[PDB]
Design an enzyme around this catalytic site. Structure first.
Site, PDB file in Angstrom:
ATOM      1  N   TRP A   1      11.235  65.279 -12.354  1.00  0.00           N
ATOM      2  CA  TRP A   1      11.841  64.513 -11.264  1.00  0.00           C
ATOM      3  C   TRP A   1      10.943  63.313 -10.929  1.00  0.00           C
ATOM      4  O   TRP A   1       9.776  63.266 -11.327  1.00  0.00           O
ATOM      5  CB  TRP A   1      12.080  65.379 -10.027  1.00  0.00           C
ATOM      6  CG  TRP A   1      10.874  66.172  -9.603  1.00  0.00           C
ATOM      7  CD1 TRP A   1       9.808  65.729  -8.852  1.00  0.00           C
ATOM      8  CD2 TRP A   1      10.611  67.541  -9.907  1.00  0.00           C
ATOM      9  NE1 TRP A   1       8.901  66.751  -8.679  1.00  0.00           N
ATOM     10  CE2 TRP A   1       9.370  67.873  -9.317  1.00  0.00           C
ATOM     11  CE3 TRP A   1      11.307  68.529 -10.625  1.00  0.00           C
ATOM     12  CZ2 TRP A   1       8.815  69.151  -9.421  1.00  0.00           C
ATOM     13  CZ3 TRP A   1      10.751  69.792 -10.733  1.00  0.00           C
ATOM     14  CH2 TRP A   1       9.516  70.094 -10.130  1.00  0.00           C
TER      15      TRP A   1
ATOM     16  N   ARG B   1       1.415  67.302 -13.395  1.00  0.00           N
ATOM     17  CA  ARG B   1       1.103  68.451 -14.246  1.00  0.00           C
ATOM     18  C   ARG B   1       0.888  69.769 -13.519  1.00  0.00           C
ATOM     19  O   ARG B   1       0.762  70.806 -14.162  1.00  0.00           O
ATOM     20  CB  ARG B   1      -0.091  68.156 -15.158  1.00  0.00           C
ATOM     21  CG  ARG B   1       0.231  67.218 -16.313  1.00  0.00           C
ATOM     22  CD  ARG B   1      -1.017  66.946 -17.156  1.00  0.00           C
ATOM     23  NE  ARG B   1      -1.883  65.918 -16.565  1.00  0.00           N
ATOM     24  CZ  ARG B   1      -3.147  65.726 -16.914  1.00  0.00           C
ATOM     25  NH1 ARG B   1      -3.701  66.495 -17.843  1.00  0.00           N
ATOM     26  NH2 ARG B   1      -3.863  64.766 -16.345  1.00  0.00           N
TER      27      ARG B   1
ATOM     28  N   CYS C   1      -0.182  62.012 -16.912  1.00  0.00           N
ATOM     29  CA  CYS C   1       0.853  62.599 -16.043  1.00  0.00           C
ATOM     30  C   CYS C   1       0.302  63.206 -14.756  1.00  0.00           C
ATOM     31  O   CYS C   1      -0.484  64.157 -14.789  1.00  0.00           O
ATOM     32  CB  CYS C   1       1.666  63.664 -16.791  1.00  0.00           C
ATOM     33  SG  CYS C   1       2.954  64.461 -15.775  1.00  0.00           S
TER      34      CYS C   1
ATOM     35  N   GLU D   1       7.715  55.158  -8.834  1.00  0.00           N
ATOM     36  CA  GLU D   1       8.222  54.757 -10.153  1.00  0.00           C
ATOM     37  C   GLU D   1       9.448  53.861  -9.985  1.00  0.00           C
ATOM     38  O   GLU D   1       9.610  52.853 -10.678  1.00  0.00           O
ATOM     39  CB  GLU D   1       8.580  55.977 -11.017  1.00  0.00           C
ATOM     40  CG  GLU D   1       7.419  56.928 -11.289  1.00  0.00           C
ATOM     41  CD  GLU D   1       7.837  58.117 -12.139  1.00  0.00           C
ATOM     42  OE1 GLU D   1       8.044  57.922 -13.354  1.00  0.00           O
ATOM     43  OE2 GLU D   1       7.959  59.245 -11.604  1.00  0.00           O
TER      44      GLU D   1
HETATM   45  C1  HEM Z   1       8.395  67.340 -12.808  1.00  0.00           C
HETATM   46  C2  HEM Z   1       7.990  66.239 -12.168  1.00  0.00           C
HETATM   47  C3  HEM Z   1       7.137  65.139 -12.841  1.00  0.00           C
HETATM   48  C4  HEM Z   1       6.579  64.120 -12.172  1.00  0.00           C
HETATM   49  C5  HEM Z   1       6.654  63.866 -10.645  1.00  0.00           C
HETATM   50  C6  HEM Z   1       5.865  63.299 -13.133  1.00  0.00           C
HETATM   51  C7  HEM Z   1       5.158  62.161 -12.848  1.00  0.00           C
HETATM   52  C8  HEM Z   1       4.800  61.223 -13.794  1.00  0.00           C
HETATM   53  C9  HEM Z   1       4.546  59.806 -13.582  1.00  0.00           C
HETATM   54  C10 HEM Z   1       4.613  59.032 -12.243  1.00  0.00           C
HETATM   55  C11 HEM Z   1       4.214  59.279 -14.763  1.00  0.00           C
HETATM   56  C12 HEM Z   1       3.880  57.795 -15.025  1.00  0.00           C
HETATM   57  C13 HEM Z   1       5.197  57.226 -15.562  1.00  0.00           C
HETATM   58  C14 HEM Z   1       5.128  55.741 -15.755  1.00  0.00           C
HETATM   59  O1  HEM Z   1       4.377  55.082 -14.984  1.00  0.00           O
HETATM   60  O2  HEM Z   1       5.839  55.229 -16.665  1.00  0.00           O
HETATM   61  C15 HEM Z   1       4.261  60.326 -15.773  1.00  0.00           C
HETATM   62  C16 HEM Z   1       3.970  60.180 -17.117  1.00  0.00           C
HETATM   63  C17 HEM Z   1       4.065  61.133 -18.109  1.00  0.00           C
HETATM   64  N1  HEM Z   1       4.565  62.427 -17.966  1.00  0.00           N
HETATM   65 FE1  HEM Z   1       4.993  63.310 -16.121  1.00  0.00          FE
HETATM   66  N2  HEM Z   1       6.026  63.856 -14.397  1.00  0.00           N
HETATM   67  C18 HEM Z   1       6.809  64.993 -14.264  1.00  0.00           C
HETATM   68  C19 HEM Z   1       7.215  65.806 -15.315  1.00  0.00           C
HETATM   69  C20 HEM Z   1       6.829  65.736 -16.641  1.00  0.00           C
HETATM   70  C21 HEM Z   1       7.270  66.595 -17.729  1.00  0.00           C
HETATM   71  C22 HEM Z   1       8.308  67.738 -17.583  1.00  0.00           C
HETATM   72  C23 HEM Z   1       6.648  66.204 -18.856  1.00  0.00           C
HETATM   73  C24 HEM Z   1       6.746  66.804 -20.291  1.00  0.00           C
HETATM   74  C25 HEM Z   1       7.141  68.064 -20.551  1.00  0.00           C
HETATM   75  C26 HEM Z   1       5.789  65.086 -18.515  1.00  0.00           C
HETATM   76  C27 HEM Z   1       4.960  64.399 -19.377  1.00  0.00           C
HETATM   77  C28 HEM Z   1       4.518  63.112 -19.178  1.00  0.00           C
HETATM   78  C29 HEM Z   1       3.955  62.252 -20.200  1.00  0.00           C
HETATM   79  C30 HEM Z   1       3.711  62.567 -21.698  1.00  0.00           C
HETATM   80  C31 HEM Z   1       3.642  60.941 -19.484  1.00  0.00           C
HETATM   81  C32 HEM Z   1       3.035  59.667 -20.124  1.00  0.00           C
HETATM   82  C33 HEM Z   1       4.222  58.750 -20.412  1.00  0.00           C
HETATM   83  C34 HEM Z   1       3.821  57.531 -21.188  1.00  0.00           C
HETATM   84  O3  HEM Z   1       2.671  57.498 -21.713  1.00  0.00           O
HETATM   85  O4  HEM Z   1       4.670  56.596 -21.271  1.00  0.00           O
HETATM   86  N3  HEM Z   1       5.939  64.827 -17.170  1.00  0.00           N
HETATM   87  N4  HEM Z   1       4.617  61.497 -15.136  1.00  0.00           N
HETATM   88  C1  LIG Z   2       5.788  51.298 -20.906  1.00  0.00           C
HETATM   89  N1  LIG Z   2       6.127  51.480 -19.510  1.00  0.00           N
HETATM   90  C2  LIG Z   2       7.505  51.350 -19.084  1.00  0.00           C
HETATM   91  C3  LIG Z   2       8.380  52.427 -19.717  1.00  0.00           C
HETATM   92  N2  LIG Z   2       8.805  53.271 -18.604  1.00  0.00           N
HETATM   93  C4  LIG Z   2       9.588  52.721 -17.506  1.00  0.00           C
HETATM   94  C5  LIG Z   2       8.436  54.621 -18.597  1.00  0.00           C
HETATM   95  C6  LIG Z   2       7.352  55.023 -19.377  1.00  0.00           C
HETATM   96  N3  LIG Z   2       6.955  56.299 -19.398  1.00  0.00           N
HETATM   97  C7  LIG Z   2       7.595  57.214 -18.664  1.00  0.00           C
HETATM   98  C8  LIG Z   2       8.690  56.873 -17.867  1.00  0.00           C
HETATM   99  C9  LIG Z   2       9.353  57.966 -17.056  1.00  0.00           C
HETATM  100  C10 LIG Z   2       8.130  58.723 -16.559  1.00  0.00           C
HETATM  101  C11 LIG Z   2       8.438  60.085 -16.019  1.00  0.00           C
HETATM  102  C12 LIG Z   2       8.743  61.123 -16.883  1.00  0.00           C
HETATM  103  C13 LIG Z   2       9.029  62.372 -16.361  1.00  0.00           C
HETATM  104  C14 LIG Z   2       9.353  63.496 -17.318  1.00  0.00           C
HETATM  105  C15 LIG Z   2       8.982  62.549 -14.975  1.00  0.00           C
HETATM  106  C16 LIG Z   2       8.655  61.460 -14.142  1.00  0.00           C
HETATM  107  N4  LIG Z   2       8.589  61.557 -12.785  1.00  0.00           N
HETATM  108  N5  LIG Z   2       8.399  60.264 -14.687  1.00  0.00           N
HETATM  109  C17 LIG Z   2       9.121  55.552 -17.819  1.00  0.00           C
END
Ligand code: HEM
Ligand SMILES: CNCCN(C)c1cncc(CCc2cc(C)cc(N)n2)c1
Ligand code: HEM
Ligand SMILES: CNCCN(C)c1cncc(CCc2cc(C)cc(N)n2)c1
Ligand SMILES: C[C@H](O)[C@H](O)[C@H]1CNc2nc(N)[nH]c(=O)c2N1
Ligand SMILES: C[C@H](O)[C@H](O)[C@H]1CNc2nc(N)[nH]c(=O)c2N1
Ligand SMILES: [Zn+2]
Lengths: 407, 411
Positions: free
Chosen positions: B280, B111, B108, B285
């Protein structure tokens, strides 16, 4: 223990068996992945020789043959008597091609079997080295129709008689620290430039000065030579739509030629083994031109395009980036100097990867390096799972010789 | 042991000690790196050490380590585990836990915001209808009329694995995908399988390109039930371009709230199988992955046609050029409508500061370079040049199997 890689765009799954022949360490453990880290005796020698000769003789469908056993015997004799051994021409060529084939950070490996190997093991002096390198440069350049090549100098003996090319690439531009505090030329080459001046080079203190070669033979002190200017093919950079782009005065050299790596074949170490192919556009346009610690031209280009540079969210950097890379590809193509764009190259690598899995059981690949520094996810490699592991023969990093050299 | 990471742009070297607290495995070995691999019922036996490790961390964080309160709590949990085979977290521990799972999320980039997370405790929830209510409230609170707020809603933890709470949707808000008899796809191809499940479960599909999927909610191991999120709660943004007026006519929009709902939250050995969380969007994305992946909406060609780029050879970089304009459009549209969004330059720059702060104050920051680096313009963002160390800390968010493959149907 039998690993699968998935392509998330196509759902194609490949099974890797080749990794079980891996040997060197990755830097990673079960507790910690170091995937993004840039730089993570007779007894020792014979199994290495044997492992290599085994794979060599397997490749020519002669495994377990008398000539295989004979060769193994001969090499063992030679190691026992002389503490080292000499590669046969066939083995040397096989080894060099396979080092490239095994280069996990190289996107261009579909080309691996078409490598011109220049045997320079008869070289004894830096003057000799210079001649061999000029010939390499001229051969590989081929008036712009580039051909992959490697020139291989005598192998390491006792470590006190290494052949080394002190330059990191055969062709690079000098870098000078100004009193203005700024940096003139390529910032990546400041230290090496100093060493050239230190060693007597008369620098022209320009922005695109081709560095001289600093050549070390038989562990002796390195000497300076200038590559004949007429052998260094350069491409002035212009843009097909933007007439003003040429006023930036940008150019780059046609020949990417890595000269600081170590070639290991059958336990033997070739500390001087310059190799070359042709550029992928982003190498020049994204990294060389747009890296902050390199020529760093984004802002200047952006201003010329009259972009709103007030807010990052206008993506002015991304726009200028694209245009810079369009110009690089356009300029090389117009001058008929071989170049490949990141779409074409990554697409080729996917097909290579499938060929390798099908015919070799795998293909070690470092995703962090394979995915281009722009537009990552619109290239097929981004969606391709890859396994990174070390196979030999291989190209290795080695310490810069100025920290090594007892003058 | 000390590990160093280097930024190759700035030559800044950081020293990691936090990796010493790493627990779970990476998938990697001394012989193989699996850094680009996407996807690499518990006894009281394993449970108390996990509980204890967590509580020691919680009690250190509040500067009460070794206190009577700390000791009584360990005692209390130990007893509750040997009595009931599990234990319940205090509200304070749950909140701390959820925040730290995010803090530890190595994939993420967002963070820097980890300490600002609204935690909704839904452990009193018993039915799918109750889950629907909680999720509506989460969506309304998080959306906040476009001024997005990070939030997580935590449903009851796993017990015997036969009574799991699950949100079957991968995200709370996503668009339906429909496979056509001619093999083409209407809507989002990513969601075809789940859409088919919804339809089979009784959902009446409008069959358009941007249909918000119903929620499919499983409470207490029972069969999941369908619910439609009130349309007035689903904030969406029509996508237009500041210079290209034809862009609006592409008919694109996207929803404002990214809310992951298919992951598992582990805290102190406890498993929260239903824990939707939202923040957000980062622009890429949507503009890069959702719109431009060949396996998603795949709009690059149509866009490039309308810009009249030379599409006869990739060497014109028509794809790159169109990619940028689309991402400009996404950012423009969200900003214009006052819906929170962050560009990849801002987000990666903030992440580097966060990461450095973490090294200094925490002794490290586990990060997955492969995921952290944005899917466009990689090396003109500072994360590209940043060496990272990936390892696993708890509390954590983990993947789990999709419930339709594991659910035992009651019928
Ligand atoms: C608040 C603004 C946030 C932004 C801009 C952000 C940004 C991102 C982005 C760009 C990704 C990659 C997503 C993808 O490519 O599918 C990601 C993944 C992730 N985020 Fe964040 N995030 C935010 C909030 C959060 C919050 C609130 C949580 C949990 C409390 C979180 C936990 C995670 C986790 C666990 C992943 C890995 C997802 C996966 O493995 O599929 N994020 N985030
Ligand atoms: C396996 N990859 C495709 C699944 N996918 C589109 C996906 C996977 N993992 C996370 C998201 C949303 C990611 C996300 C989550 C949060 C809380 C904030 C943010 N900006 N993006 C989407
Ligand atoms: C012929 C066309 C070739 C192309 C398009 C190509 C492309 C590339 C690219 C883009 C990189 C990343 C380099 C960087 O970002 O600094 C790379 C690395 C590398 N290439 Fe290739 N290459 C080619 C030929 C060759 C040849 C002929 C060899 C050896 C005989 C070779 C061996 C390597 C090695 C060892 C690396 C890793 C370099 C390092 O770790 O610093 N390549 N290549
Ligand atoms: C970490 N890199 C900084 C030095 N640098 C720019 C660099 C490093 N390693 C290799 C190269 C050249 C890469 C290369 C080699 C060959 C044979 C062909 C090609 N297109 N690119 C350049
Ligand atoms: C195979 C590879 O790991 C896969 O394409 C990854 C690469 N990096 C990513 N990074 C992010 N943020 N999101 C992703 O889905 C992916 N996909
Ligand atoms: C820290 C990170 O490993 C470093 O910036 C890498 C990333 N990927 C790269 N990829 C290529 N092809 N070349 C590079 O120099 C780098 N640099
Ligand atoms: Zn690894």
């Amino acid at each position: 223990r039998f690993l699968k890689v998935k392509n998330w765009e196509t759902d194609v799954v490949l099974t890797d068996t080749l990794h079980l022949k891996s040997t060197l360490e990755t830097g990673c453990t079960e507790h910690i992945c170091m995937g993004s880290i840039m730089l993570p005796t007779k007894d020792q020698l014979f199994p290495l020789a044997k492992e290599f000769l085994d794979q060599y003789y397997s490749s020519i469908k002669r495994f377990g043959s008398k000539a295989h056993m004979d060769r193994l015997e001969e090499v063992n004799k030679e190691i026992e008597s002389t503490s080292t051994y000499q590669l046969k021409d066939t083995e040397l060529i096989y080894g060099a091609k396979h080092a490239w084939r095994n280069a996990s950070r190289c996107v261009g490996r579909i080309q691996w079997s078409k490598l011109q190997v220049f045997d320079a093991r008869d070289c004894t002096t830096a003057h000799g080295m210079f001649n061999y390198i000029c010939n390499h440069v001229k051969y590989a350049t081929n008036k712009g129709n580039l051909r992959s090549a490697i020139t291989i100098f005598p192998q390491r003996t006792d470590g006190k008689h290494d052949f080394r090319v002190w330059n990191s690439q055969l062709i690079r531009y000098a870098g000078y620290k100004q009193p203005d505090g700024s940096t003139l030329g390529d910032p990546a080459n400041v230290q090496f430039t100093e060493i050239c001046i230190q060693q007597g080079w008369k620098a022209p203190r320009g922005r695109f000065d081709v560095l001289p070669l600093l050549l070390q033979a038989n562990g002796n002190d390195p000497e300076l030579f200038q590559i004949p200017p007429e052998l260094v093919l350069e491409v002035p950079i212009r843009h097909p739509k933007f007439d003003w782009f040429k006023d930036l005065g940008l150019k780059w050299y046609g020949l990417p030629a890595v000269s600081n790596m170590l070639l290991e074949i059958g336990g033997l170490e070739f500390s001087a083994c310059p190799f070359s192919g042709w550029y992928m556009g982003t190498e020049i346009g994204v990294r060389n031109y747009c890296d902050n610690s390199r020529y760093n031209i984004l802002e200047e280009v952006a201003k010329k395009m009259d972009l709103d540079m007030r807010k990052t969210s206008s993506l002015w950097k991304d726009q200028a980036l694209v245009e810079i890379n369009i110009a690089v590809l356009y300029s090389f193509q117009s001058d008929k100097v071989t170049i490949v764009d990141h779409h074409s190259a990554t697409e080729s690598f996917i097909k290579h990867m499938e060929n390798e899995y099908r015919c070799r059981g795998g293909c070690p690949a470092d995703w962090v390096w394979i995915v281009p520094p722009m537009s990552g996810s619109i290239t097929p490699v981004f969606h391709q799972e890859m396994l990174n592991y070390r196979l030999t023969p291989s190209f290795e990093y080695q310490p810069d010789p100025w920290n090594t050299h007892v003058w």
